[model samples]
Structures are given as structure tokens and as C-alpha cells.
Target chain A: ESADLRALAKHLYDSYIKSFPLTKAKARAILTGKTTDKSPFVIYDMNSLMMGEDKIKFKHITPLQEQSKEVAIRIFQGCQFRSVEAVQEITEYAKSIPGFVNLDLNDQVTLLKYGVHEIIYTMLASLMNKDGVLISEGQGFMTREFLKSLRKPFGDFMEPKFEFAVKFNALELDDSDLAIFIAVIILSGDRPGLLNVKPIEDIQDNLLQALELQLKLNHPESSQLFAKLLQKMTDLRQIVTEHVQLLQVIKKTETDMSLHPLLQEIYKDL
Target chain B: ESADLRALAKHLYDSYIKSFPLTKAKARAILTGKTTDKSPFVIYDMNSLMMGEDKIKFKHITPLQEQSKEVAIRIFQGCQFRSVEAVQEITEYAKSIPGFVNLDLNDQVTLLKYGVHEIIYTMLASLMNKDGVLISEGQGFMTREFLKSLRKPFGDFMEPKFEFAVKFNALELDDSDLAIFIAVIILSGDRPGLLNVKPIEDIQDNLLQALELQLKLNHPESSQLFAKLLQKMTDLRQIVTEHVQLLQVIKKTETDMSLHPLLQEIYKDL
Candidate 1:
């Protein structure tokens, strides 16, 4: 029965990966360049709200110190904006997928609330060069060293994702592989608060088959590639759990910062 | 709405604590007494399967030479049995709760599958003296030092829980407080794979209120108790992730060992 799912998934993967005009690395490199002052300059994309000099740079500079909660909050806001936008894109992408869109609305939202951050982290695997994520869409890049330089709460907040990112990158999945995996995650039945689990579970179960075959086709020689990728999902969940913790802490400590209402819902009692 | 839930939850917690005839420390001390030869002794209770002389000991006089797969698997099995039993106890306990068993059978199975280890570690809270878990139903004591003495995999396996245990004890929760927290963990709608989430979430939501009240009533003066206790849940998840990883390695490396099917299912794709 899953034989059908396998072929269907591979076809979707082909279309999905091809739909992205550029792999994350190429897109990042194309959107960013070494501008004057020698910092890696990032051009604005459609998603970000930064004004005139929206040319953020991955200068490998330290983020804000904890002392000035104001500045730290502003920087965190930027980080948060970029993260949630990535989430929005993934949510839209999942909805566009045939099987996934068919799930109930509440189930869809529940899956998105719980699953998007992990999917974003998974997708970030594409953008990651060595050990850091290309932040600000394609602009800002923060390395482990740079992330460590940030002050309390904020530093702790960002490090866990990078921890997952570093391990995820080690899996060496291509763009086609990641899109399908993310699709499976988004259509997951296991997410809490779902109204109808079977429909999504059926979809996810099928995707599960698709993923296994797709991974086998993608990496024939690597026997444990599927298990390794599967394990990364576990790691991603752990990182995101802490990520939620960081959000809850931010909401408690900083009133000036604004968290998107959607994100607030995701992080609430979660 | 939560007002009655709080009262009901408090009633359950009181009964729960009294049912356990042992304080973890005291039970551990009783099982592990002064040996004439000074080898650590583990006396079993009704819980452990070892019969005749239910006296087990931390004869870890030699932790792990790794030269013997036979010896290593034996130690791992002992640890494994003790852990899954804890999982079982929590599972039965959660079923005994007012509304839990009435949940959809699939949801009950799902919650138990995903949430048991966290609850095991939570209930293991009582069994943990600093930096170690009492080995046989809070009988045989194993310290961080002895855990390190074990062979490569076994040492790595046992250590993370102790690390969490050490930090958790620092929070200074009374057994009653720990009881309520365990109940919340067991009923967590947040666990993956739940079908009907509301019943469990409602239970947890009320338990959350009860826990808050219990903390304040118990401590009265501590400001961060609730937050700290909540944070422990996240920490517990992280610790359990590593634990699942440990079990996977043992299942992979040691063919002679029989990992219980339920434990295997819990760790599957998890």
C-alpha cells in the first residue's frame, strides 16, 4: 500500500525541491555579498520589515549584551521576526501540499503550532554552512562563538537551536530530502490539540513510507541515513522545547518586546 | 473551573504520597546497608523481580572493563528493568487518576508511550539522592562515581539522569509537591501521539492550578518555586532524550540483550 505513497512522495519531493529556485546556500550566497567595510552584506528579501539600509550583515559580530535589555530586546525582536516568518512560509508550504491541506483546520493549526519551529530548524539545515544558521532570512549569520558572546537569557535562548543545527547538518541531507521530511513533520498526527488524529496519522504514515524510500533513493550507500535523520527530529524537538522556554522567559521579563500573537499561542503552556 | 480541579488534585496527591511507604532516601538506606565486606548491597522489595535473597548489591567493585559484553549487558538489563518498571507504575497510577482512564484508549496508550519516561524520571525524583538513582526500587544505591566506573556505554547511559537528579534535588520540593508534579506529567496533553487531547489537557490544566497552590502553600515564602518546577519538566525532557539515545545504542550493540517491546516502542522514531 505504501508503494503508492513512496512514488507519490518522491514525485512531490522532485517538484518541491525544484520549485525553490535556489538551494539555501546558493540563495544565501546570491542574496549576500562582501560589501564595503568588508562585512558580509545581506540584501533585503520580501519577508523582512527592515527599512532603507536593510542590508544586514553577517559580520560574525556579537549580538547584544544582557545589560541593556532594551537593545537585547530589539535584537531578539529581529531574530524572532525572522524565525516566525520562516515558520509562516513553512506553514503555507505545508498547506499547499495535497495530503496535508486536507487535514482539519484545528489539526492544521495544532500541527503548525507545535511543528513549525522544528521544521524551520530542519529547513535551516539547508542554509547552514559549517556550524551556524544564516539568520535574517539570508542576511545575518551567527556562529556558535558569536552566539556565546550574547548576554544572559538571550545567549541561552539562541544556543540550543545552533546545537540542533550543528548536529542536523551532520546528516547531510539535500534540499529535496528536507522538504519531504518537513512535509511529514507538518502533517504529523502526534501533535497535541488535534481534533482528528487518524486523517493526519494516515497522511503522516504514508509520508513516513515516502520518507523511508526517498531517503533510501537519496543515500543508497548510507545504511543508517534514515535513522540518523529520524534521530535529528528528536534533537530538534529538544532544542525547540528549550526555544519555547526562552520565549516564555522573554514574555515574562520584557514588556517592550512584541511577540507575534501566533507565536504567543504556540509557546503558551506548550 | 479550575477551583474544584485544584481541590480534587490535592486530594489525589495526598493519597498518592501516603501510598508509597518509603521516602526515597530512607528506602535506599535500608536496602543498602553497611556490608561487612563493604560491597554495596541492594535489598529488593515487592517491586523488583529478584527472588530468594532479594538483596542486590552495587558490587561495582569493578565498574566496567568492557572486556566482557556479557557483564555489561547484565548491568544494562538490571538498569533497564528498573526503569521500565517505573514507567509501568506511573502508567498504572495515571490510569487510576479520576479522568485519565476514561480518555480514548488510543489516547491513553499514546500518552503513556510518550509521557512515561518523563514521569519515570520525575517519580525517580524521590529515588534520587544527590547525583545517583537508587538502583532496585530505591534499594541499591549507585553514585555518580560508580556510574562512571561502568564500561563506556553503560556509564554514558546512567549519567544524564543523575545530572538532572542533582539539579532537581536542589529545587527542594517536598514529596507531596513532587506527587502533584508527577500527576501533571503523566496527564500531560502535550505529549506526542495523543488522540483526544482535551480530557488530558483539562486534567493537566487543573493540576497546574493545584500545583501552583500547593507550592505556595507549602513554601509560602519562595517566589521562584513554580517557575523552577515548571522548568524542570523541560530539563527532564532533555535528560530523557539522551536516555532514549542510550537505549538505542544498547539495542544496536548488544544482540543478546532483550529490550522490552514497550521500551522499544517508546524509543521508536522518538
Candidate 2:
């Protein structure tokens, strides 16, 4: 059990570093016990981070941080069973969840480091307007509201430490505010219900249209928040769109599995 | 006399800065009493001069530096005579010197700041071989050896501050050595009868050849020294070569005036 834990930790550390080469040197030092300093697990306010003398800081999304906690709980549950295979299988399964498929590279990197696949899923839920699918249907393990609150404590994580910081103001609005706004319907003052109102697909289309309207209105504060959100959303959309296209090509190249009821059910809603 | 001196000084200051824009702000400050420091007139070590901390360093062969010095000297000489007419005459005569015809924009700018005619002549003399007519004759005031040695002491003058200590070592040659060599050979030597050699035309070919050779070698240290020398030589050669080419184009140029008759006579004797 001890050897398995060590191997799992090492694998996670190696994977995280490989995905983020810029922080590899310091991350390696910390992970190997060559350095006693703890790697930052929370996002920092750009203004405060810049003021601090600490040479390195991590940037994250609040929703992702909350999701990471759930992932950690799941991984620990597997560890408690002394089932290394179970831990690996769960981790891989978490990565393939629809919510995990929608994050930008930056958020994805943060999620990987936090060992949470739910953060990515929440991002996809926000984009897909299907937040309840993961929370209510997927074992009641995560919720959009919970993820939204995490943004306040994890606000600093979302603030850019490098290029974006120079180009955009990251300290003015915390991610919690943005995430709460996304999860709650501002006009109706109610949580979006799963009932016979709008389908998840229609909600995504309406949200994008509303966001575009806000941009056109030139609302300064909303524009700023939307700009960052838009960058992430755009990147995610491109990846998913390309993946869908690749699926089509693969489908054409192989035998039609649509006749198989299991395969048909798996892709029916996709 | 005082008013006239002030006018000449102003003209010199303006012309000097105008010719060498790189040296303008500091040089202008010094001339206008904004800066009190006066740099030493000494030859700089090639490496040090290229990467020197000083704001201004003498580059002997650069057309701008040469022109600035020429204009300043002319102004000084004109001021001594209290003759605005003499200044005007010398200015026109200086403008008419042979080697400044087809310079591109950068050279034109430097030439304007430094003044053209006299600077071009000085540069030609520095680059001309010992056997060349300019050095063999008395027209070029200093020899290559003298100019090289002068570069040491003169390098100090080229810098904005007049604080240079002469250093000597076994492998390292000082500027004075070069200055003395030129003085001994061209100024005081008896081998070439000063009266018989042609001044400008005879040395033109050798100057061009030396510049071409230095460029082809392409060693950084040698290249810098060569670049400095070439900047000056090219200024003079531009005029002569342009005139020679123009005459050829017009079918008015002749070979009879090419080499000095005395040099030809000496060559036949050899």
C-alpha cells in the first residue's frame, strides 16, 4: 500500500510537470523533498501576488478548485481500499467526463495539478448549461454553486501571473462573482431548473447570445469579466468542435456501430 | 571679436551636433553649458570603445566624427581670423572636396553634422598606405602611424569626459605607438619626396583595396577597427569614385591623370 501510494504520487507529479514545463524546476524540487516549500494550491489576486516577494505563484479557476476537492476525496476513497487499480481507473474515468472535456489549457493544467476532474466538468456544465447532470446525476459529488463559492477563496488562482496579467487587469473582479453570476439566473433570481423549460443545448445557445449582447452594449465591467470567460470558452469550443469532427471521420472510416443499442445510447445525447 | 566668436561657436556647435545625431544631445548639452564635463582626447582600445560605458567615444574613421572635428577646427581657425568671410570661404571649399558625392542617407546625415570636405581628407590620409601619394605628399597632414598613435591620446578627446589613464603592456600596443609610427614615416620620413606625390587620386585605389581586404577577413576586432577606418575612407572614396565613374559615363575621363607621373616614374625605376 505504501509503495502503491508513492508510485501514484510520483506519477501524478510527473504528469503535472510534463504539462507545465515553466514550473517544472521548482515543482520537481518541492515534490522530491529537495525543497521544503509547499507549492501554491490556491489562486492569488494579481495585485497582491505582484506585490509579494515570492518569485512564483499559481493561477487557477475557483470552480476548478472546488472540483479538485471532490476528486481528491474520490482518489482517497480508492486509496483507503488499498486498490491501486481502482484509483487509476477512477482517475482516468474522471478525465473522460463531459465536464472535463470543456476547459481551456490553463484551467485544464490547474485541474490536473489539483487532482480534480470535476473542475473541468463544471466548466463544461457552465458552457453546456447542464450543471445538474454532474451534481444530481453523478453521485451528488459536485455542484455549480459549491464551485462558484470556491472562486472567492481561489480568486488568486485565476489571476494571470504572466502574459495575461500584463495585458489584462486580473484583480478587479474575483472568479466567485463570475461563477455565481453564471450559476444563478440574474433576471429570475432562481436556479435553472431541470424541468420543461429550456433544453441544455438551448441554454448554451441563449447564454452565448446574451453574452454577445453584453459585449455589444459596451458594459465595461461585464465586458472585462466576459472577455476572460470568452477566451476560455472559445478555446474549449474549438477543441470540442474539432473532436466532434474527428469522431465523424472515424465513424466514416469504420463500421457503423449505430445498430448496437449500447453504443447508440452512449452517443444519443452527445 | 567676442560677438563673432560666439556666433562661430554657435555655428560650430549646431553643425557638430547636426552631423552626428548620436552625439547630439550630450554634445549639445556640453556646448550649451548644460554639462560642464569635457571628455579626454585619446585613442580608445577597439574593444573598449565599441562597448565603452562613456557616452561619446572617438571613432577615427567614422565620417560623422571626422566631419564634426573638421567643422570645429574650421570654425576655430575662422574665429582666430575674426573673418566670417573666411569661414564662409572655407565652408564652401570644404563642401567642394572630392570624395563626398554619392553617400546614402546615413552618410549624408553624418557628413552634414561633421562637415564634408576636410573630414573626408583626414579620413583618406589615415587609411592610405605608406607608399600612397597622399602620405608620400604633404597634403595629408598626418601619416597612418601618426594618426594611429594620435588615436590613443585623441581617443580621450573623442569621449565626453577627459579622464583617461594610458596603460602599457607587453602584448598590448598603445595609441601613441601608432601615432609615432605615422609621424616618423609620413611627417618626418625622407623616403618619399613630399613635393612630387599626387595628393588625392594616387592614394584612392589603395584605400579602397585595404577596406575591401579588411571587410573580407571579417574578424570582429579587426572588423570594428576596419569599420571605423572604412567609414572615413569610404566617405572620401565616394567622392573620388563617383567623379571617376561620372567622367567615364560621360566619356570625359582619361587614364593620363590616373597615377601621379612621379609615382609612375618610381615604379618604372623599381
Candidate 3:
């Protein structure tokens, strides 16, 4: 169970990270879980409207009420922009699947819409460390503390996920397990709408079977380790659900944090 | 929050039920929590199947435990056949959506592939009263005890789901709420693979927003109920993940219960 799908899964996970190159500062900040002079990036809503039109984007972005709302929006966008970029890579990686491209074009689009954000967070699982994910690829490590201080919806959107990661990371799966698990997430046949149901199921079952076989071959000594890993997907599902609800709040509030049209697409996807 | 998606959700729920009417015996068995006089279906595995060569085809006939181990295979198939039929209606209900067919075929297939079972169980959430779901369209009712008595992988597949439904039913959402909630499950944009992701997301967002508005209008006072309902999706994820793991286990174990290839295919879709 511990090692099923471990090897090939590792290869994919490595490439997933390699594709997400962060500045050394960004990487270090993520590693150290620290903040730096490179703090927040320019705000998307503020940049366009210069009035923090997206202020309602979050229920809590108003916290640390001291910073000019302008600065806060920039900080929020900085976090949003980086996460969005990371989510973008997930789309490319999914397309790289052996038969992923052959899937119905509409389905391909729908999957990305719903699962990209879910994938982004799943991939983020790999980047999760002790306290937080390497936000901005480490320009500054965003901590739970910082996330907690942000205003309502923004803070609400993120904290539960980190909390989930804190436990999921404790599972101590290596890259291979994660890679396989991540693929499992991508190839999931359980998306809401689908045309090419037969092919996708074929893909998912074969992969799942291979992963299980590998786990047995790799970790004969472990008991029920395979099921435990499967449990992680459930955990990821919970985290993703929470994050999506937060996105819903953002959508309902009509916050500028809604950001990119594509980003909004991801929000809707889940 | 509780009532947001209720009204529309009810209409869908009623349709879901109307499509799944079971025969008298099965419904009676399920209601009484007892096996019908029908006993188990015919045992085919013990027949011409030399060494269970026809292991994959489950529907022509079935078997009982009283016969040789071959009967076990038939039993597994019986349960599987019934379950597969139950899941089949999921596609019909999803298509009944306002413009579900108008969406790309790929997406329609994708959503069904990935979400069919999820939808099945969501509707199952309604049918689920005491111990188990009515299998074989009320021709047979799969009681919790009978389901629990099955062999390793099969029993494993069922228990977690029953456990989930047991608790989910506790949420006590009304039929209308379920109708809309079930829709939320179908229009979901979050399947793993998608091409034109944005439009799907748009649909999901609109539906969710509509549900939320209705919940507010209907409930008027409850706070966070909308989110709480979304969280149930997370709970559903956990249960579904566990059930999927059971499927994965059955596949790896090479249990005679693998059933029809298309049935296996449906398992993969989810």
C-alpha cells in the first residue's frame, strides 16, 4: 500500500515541480516559511480599478485592518496570481496523459474547468511542508498564521486546506505515491459530466490496478497501506470542497479576487 | 441555507425516484429488511464455466452460497448486476437537466462517467432509510446484514457507503432540497479531465448560486447552511473514495466478482 504506484508516480511528480520553477527567493521562502521584501505582488482588481473593487472578494481580507486596503488587495492578488499560475501548469500536465487528448474536446474542457483547481490543490499537496505551501513559489512562504489574519472569505478559503495538508503531509508518502495519487486524481472517472465515459473508465481502472499491484510488490510487509493511501484522495476531496465553497462565496460577493476569466473558470469547474 | 436549492432540487429528486421504481418483492424485502422467497438467483458459475472461464459475464444467471464456491461468484454478479442497473438511471436523470444534452456530448459523457455513481448514491441518499439500498429494482432488497455477509471485497464495497448514507440521511434534508442538491451533484464542473472548462464552470456556478438564493429565500434564517450542504459533498467524497478503494481491492484480488466489462467500466468512470 505504501509503495503502490510509487515509482512512475514519482517521475510525474518531479516533472510537476520542475515545471513550476520559482525564483531561488521564492523557493527559499517556501522552504523556510518566511516573508521577504518581495512581499505582495500588484493587485489585479486594484490595478484595473484602483479602488479595491474586489474588497468583498473575501470576508476577511480586511483583517490587519491597518494596511491600506490597497496593499491588502495586492497581497491577495500576489497569492492569487501565483496559485493561478500553478493551476495553469496542472492543465498542461493533464493533457500530457496518454489518452487524455483523445477524450471528447468538450469533456477535456469540462474536466479542466472542474478539476484544474482541484488538481492545483492536489499538486499543491506535493509542495506542502511543515506549516504552509510555498506560495508565489517561495517569493514568500505563506503561513497559516498569515492566512488566518486575512479577511473572511480569503482567509476562510485557504486555512482549512492548509489544515488538511498538515495532516495529509503527515502520511509521509514519497514522490512516487504522490505522482500515482495525483494521476488518480486526474484520471478520475467521477467528474460530473462526460461523453467518453468508456475510455476514461478504462484509463482509471488500469491505472488503479497497476498502482495496487505496485504497492503490493513494493511494500509486501505493510498491511492495509494501500487502502490508507486511497483514503488520502478522500481527504483531498474534503479540502478541495472547502476551498471551492470559499470560491463560491467569492463569486457570490462578486469580489475582484475572482481574478482571471480562466481562474473563474476553474472556480466554476469544481 | 438549508432551503436554497430545495425547490428545484425536489423536482429533480421526484424524477429520480419515478425512474427508479422497484418491483413489489424487492421493495417489500428492503422495507421489511428480510430476504424474499425468491432466494438467490440461479448459479451460473457452477455450470458450463470450466474454471470460471466466463467470469466476466454476470447477468445471464446467478448462484447461491449453498452450492460450491461457484455460487459465490454468481452471488457477486447478482449484487453487481443490480447495482449497475441502479447506477444506470443516473445518466437519464442527469440528461433530464434543462439543457444537459445541449452541452457537448463529451462533457455529458464525462460527467456521467465520473459522476454517475456519485449521483446514484446521492439519490440513494433518499432511498436509503434503514439498512441498505433496494437492489434489482425491488426484485431484491440488499439488506445491510446480507450485504455485510458477502465475501471480503464485496462486503467492503457496501459497508462504507451504507455508513455514509446512514449519516447523510441524518442530515434530514427534504425532497425538494434533495432534488436541487442532486442537481448540484450532476452539473458539477469538477470531473478530472475537461477541455472547454469555463462554460461548465459557468453552469455549475449559476446552479449553485440559484440554489443558494432559493435556500436563503426558503430558510431565511439559517447561516452557512449552503456551505454545510457543500461540505456534504466532501463527506460524499470520503465515502465514495472508500467504496472505490474496495473496487480497486476487488480488481487486484482478482475476485470472481469483477462482473461485466461494461460494469467494470462504470466502476472506473467513477
B9-113: candidate 3 lDDT, tens digit per residue: 565656756665642223434555355554422212234223232433335443344454444355566656656776666666677666677888888877777
| Model 1 misplaced regions, further than 4 Å | A1-270, B1-6, B18-69
Which pairs of residues clash in candidate 1, taking residues 3 or more apart in a chain or in different chains? B42-B56
Q: Please give, for residues B1-270, the per-residue lDDT of candidate 2 as tens digits.
A: 334433433343344333322231332233233444653222133333223224342223333334344322322232233222323433343333234233233333333322322233332233222321121112121222322333322322212111010111111222222221111112110112233223322323232332233333333333223222322222332333343333343233323323323222222110
Report the Cα lDDT for residue B114, model 1: 74
* Candidate 2 - chain A - TM: 0.24
Model 1, global lDDT: 0.62
Report iRMS values in order: 16.2, 29.8, 15.5
Q: Model 1, A144: alpha-carbon shift in Å?
A: 28
Best by DockQ: 3
Cα lDDT for residue A30, candidate 3: 38
Task: Give the TM-score of each candidate.
Answer: 0.48, 0.16, 0.45
Ranking by DockQ: 3, 1, 2
